[PDB]
Amino acid sequence: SKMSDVKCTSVVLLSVLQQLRVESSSKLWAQCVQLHNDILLAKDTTEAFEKMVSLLSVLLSMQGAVDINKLCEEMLDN
Amino acid sequence: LPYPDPSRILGAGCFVDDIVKTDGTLMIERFVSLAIDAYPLTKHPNQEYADVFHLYLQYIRKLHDELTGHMLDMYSVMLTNDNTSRYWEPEFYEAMYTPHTVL
Amino acid sequence: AVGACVLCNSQTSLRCGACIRRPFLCCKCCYDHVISTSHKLVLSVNPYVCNAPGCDVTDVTQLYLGGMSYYCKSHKPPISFPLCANGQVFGLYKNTCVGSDNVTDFNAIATCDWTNAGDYILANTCTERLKLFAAETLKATEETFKLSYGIATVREVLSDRELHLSWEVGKPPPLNRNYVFTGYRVTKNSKVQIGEYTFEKGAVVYRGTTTYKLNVGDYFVLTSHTVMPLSAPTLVPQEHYVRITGLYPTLNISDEFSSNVANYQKVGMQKYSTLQGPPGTGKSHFAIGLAL
Amino acid sequence: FSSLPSYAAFATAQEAYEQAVANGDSEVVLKKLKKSLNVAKSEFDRDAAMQRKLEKMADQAMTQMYKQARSEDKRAKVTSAMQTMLFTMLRKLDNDALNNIINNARDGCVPLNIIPLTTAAKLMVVIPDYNTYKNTCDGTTFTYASALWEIQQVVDADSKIVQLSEISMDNSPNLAWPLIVTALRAN
Amino acid sequence: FSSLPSYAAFATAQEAYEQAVANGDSEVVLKKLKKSLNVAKSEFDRDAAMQRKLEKMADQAMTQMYKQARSEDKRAKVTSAMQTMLFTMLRKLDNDALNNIINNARDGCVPLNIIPLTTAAKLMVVIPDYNTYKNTCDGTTFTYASALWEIQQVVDADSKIVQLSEISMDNSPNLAWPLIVTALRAN
RNA sequence: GCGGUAGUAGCAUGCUAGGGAGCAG
RNA sequence: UGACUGCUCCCUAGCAUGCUACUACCG
Ligand SMILES: [Zn+2]
Ligand SMILES: [Zn+2]
Ligand SMILES: [Zn+2]
Structure with missing residues (x-):
């Protein structure tokens, strides 16, 4: 339902973050792997929507890499 | 009859290793070898377990209508559905749990 | 690898193998380009070659497709059909094919040295995309022939302003240094930064554009990238715009020019324009005008 | 089927042996004609089975080809696709914290x-313009990720410690607006 | 089939029978018209069913012999790669400190x-945290394995050069911690 | 009238090899 | 970077057997 839609968006969020060569900083890849392994083992949709803000904020703090504007005006959340 | 854990057969079609099953038409043999393992769930008293087998038989047909319908709208090819219907019928899989071995 | 035969506007997946750019040809260009012009090679999602230990018969001539691969005549596992048959070449899109009435495009341009007058004049009577491909083949022929030239090197460091250079022996060597030579250096086995050098005079006098540090054995040779495909025409049809609506004109107007408001209104009600301007014909100060 | 070169033998002989019983003849003529029908019938049920196998064989090689070409465009476009997948999936969740930081x-x-979940939880964002500051934070209170933080320090481009009283659609045009606001979580 | 030694009989028997059809043939010559291309045709088919078997046999040694060649060429490329190793890991034995324990x-x-422990020139120490660092590798020199080693480099997990002043008690939270110290033997 | 012999085409079984994929400890 | 075993489904190539029609000689 809602706990299975968060558990599949955190598999696509650590693949976008693994294709951007975030594996080359082993002080931040060690936190992203702990916020993704912890969401998958969660048993409440109120304590897995707050590790999805920490994990998503890693992608929005990486500047140029992902064009957020283009990707949001691409028939998606406006 | 032996039957698996439903979360193991369901979770084996959702999570894979790219080009594998991130496009089901390029490998429909993965889902015929996963519906053989899910067959004896049809006899379970729980009706939420017996649905895992009918969900796999309905997806193999979806992946076959697409394949034989994706090679007709981009390449004027017409595939014949003869000897393909056996994989969404519950008699190809029932024969794997009955004596008098074959093949 | 599903490109487009823009010799027909047909969407195909083949390409001429022993050809200049290896472009996309349909089942009706790659049918007649091979028989007359000796391009006995086609490239697909998998090359049309024999598939049996040692074979050296690679000619999509009478090759037969069987057993999930392309076999040959000489040794015959024939039990199949030839690749070229019934005015077509085998491949995807074997049904949705259009054809071309100008057969001798490759037959005329894929064999010549891309310098004859006839090729150019028939090019200037083609369409926009075929001529775009012709210009990409001119860049591609220049770059292909760019790796058939000589190489410079220095094996002995001498005092400044007096060096020696040998290029090559017994091969057909003039070059108006237009684009200058920046190769990269070598010391023992790896690459070493050298910079860019200019050879104009020339024991042999050497000038210096900038200070550098010569090493023993430094080579010089140019590597040029390949022009990528583009997706836009060159010219555009003539279509006058509705009005000058959608612009922000300014209250102030120049007065040293007596042909400024007229041309401003003209560009306001005109879409595309070309002229024949010599140096100093508006390129100097009119850009600032339209800017302000 | 038709159009096969060996088809004008199963037509003449088929028509002949056929009409032959109305007019009729000796048994010899009948046997002779049947031993021409079968002699030029095998030639048809052999050239229309080899074709029957080539026509389906052809439609298989030209299907592995369609797979080796879609599976090389599915792999060369990975990056562009998983970023579209993620944002198609992020809209459907309709969260409040996730739809704010986005x-x-x-x-x-x-x-x-990283957005920390603790109770001290220092944060650093970059407000680019005055309107974004006015909407987000008013006073010493800051709203972010559906949570409330308390501003502890404001810093302009180099190290310019802005006091909260001098950022007001006024003194504001006179600074380097990419600020670096530091805050701590609340409770 | 143009060189099979049984084409002459077949060709002649065909000519005799087939070509002589228009000419009036009695019921006694018809046997020659019939039982002369027969038998000859049987033998020809026998001469063609053996040729087809000899061809295939032949084209099963001109494929199994490319594979015996391929493998020997390969056997000579690995036999020359292990040799180029066991002679490059040998020019590296400080044969003054090794001939002193043998x-x-x-x-x-x-x-x-005990060969790398008593006859080596370099030491690599991998350190998890800061507490382990001050009990193993403090200062520019340290003693280990009844010797004295002097530090030469301290890279980290990312493989970026660290200096022996970034390693504090409180700067430690700011380093990729599996730290790799490379030291050389003294005296 | 029938049987045997040698080729040819067509349909299933078993076995031997190669290739891709699924599960289990 | 990708271990050792066992089972099993699908596709292609080759070998032998099993009921038929076609050939042709032979009875
Ligand atoms: Zn060509
Ligand atoms: Zn074409
Ligand atoms: Zn071959």
């Missing part, structure tokens, strides 16, 4: 670290 | 675990 980081308010 | 040995046999 809208905020589209106008400019991106963070500079 | 000599003090009773018979010349020594444990292998």
